[PDB]
Design a protein around this ligand. Sequence first.
Ligand SMILES: c1cc(-c2cnn3cc(-c4ccc(OCCN5CCCCC5)cc4)cnc23)ccn1
Length: 315
Amino acid sequence: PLGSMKDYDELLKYYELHETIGTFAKVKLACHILTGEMVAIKIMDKNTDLPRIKTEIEALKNLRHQHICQLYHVLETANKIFMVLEYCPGGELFDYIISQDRLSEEETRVVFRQIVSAVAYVHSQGYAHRDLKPENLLFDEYHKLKLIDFGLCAKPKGNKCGSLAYAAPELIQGKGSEADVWSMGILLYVLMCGFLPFDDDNVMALYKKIMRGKYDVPKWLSPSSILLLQQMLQVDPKKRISMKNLLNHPWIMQDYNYPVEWQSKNPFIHLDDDCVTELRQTMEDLISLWQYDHLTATYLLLLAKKARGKPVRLR
Ligand SMILES: c1cc(-c2cnn3cc(-c4ccc(OCCN5CCCCC5)cc4)cnc23)ccn1
């Protein structure tokens, strides 16, 4: 509630602000001046959950995946915190499901394999999203999914929440990795049905439906889909299917005949030659630091500009 325009001084030196596109914090579309690439900037007012956005930043600095919304630049003033992120024009998965009522099994698989790829990578780095829901999955320009909102993420094996409808029965009991598998199971159901497996007007009724684990199985669901849903939506976390068995699951393997490529194609070590070749050893040393300043943003967007096919240049 300060309303200061001086906080935008450092930001406008690298980006051109446009319109507001997304929702607590405020999200605005912007254009990286040096590269010309479009970006999404999240703006948090420090006077208006601070440790929640601090959790997301710390995670996105260590996480880099083709199905995770990339963090380009972090800028903090005296009153605001700016987060320059990958721009996803396709919008929420949630909105896509509503517009299409429900997705076919084939359509779902294309989408779901990208979700599995992201979450498997997240778990491999010792993280757990803990808030998997269709609102937190965005389509990019190539209509591929990008996982967002790591504000509630945590390290299950580290030092010492989300939507109830996607919460694992263990979380309701008040008892980490297997929790995300459950949520993906809920996601799988919604994708192919268009509605939640567990839903109710009353909160206690809802949480009770979840812990029972009983849900309707629509007639349009194939037995293969039915089997996988059972394996993911096991009320007992120990009985729930592991990430490893999910990667090469028969349902997943259908029409593809190869396991989900969860490995990150977005490295920290290997730098691009064309992107570096500008303005060598001194330049590469600066990029490898990854301070997530203007340099990190410039390089990653220059690499994105290169992956787009556009000329590796700076306006
Ligand atoms: C991290 C990242 C983001 C974010 C990054 N890109 N991004 C993009 C959007 C967004 C982009 C475009 C939008 O318009 C949707 C238009 N729809 C698209 C579907 C077909 C009909 C027309 C709606 C939302 C929203 N949030 C983000 C938001 C919050 N936290």
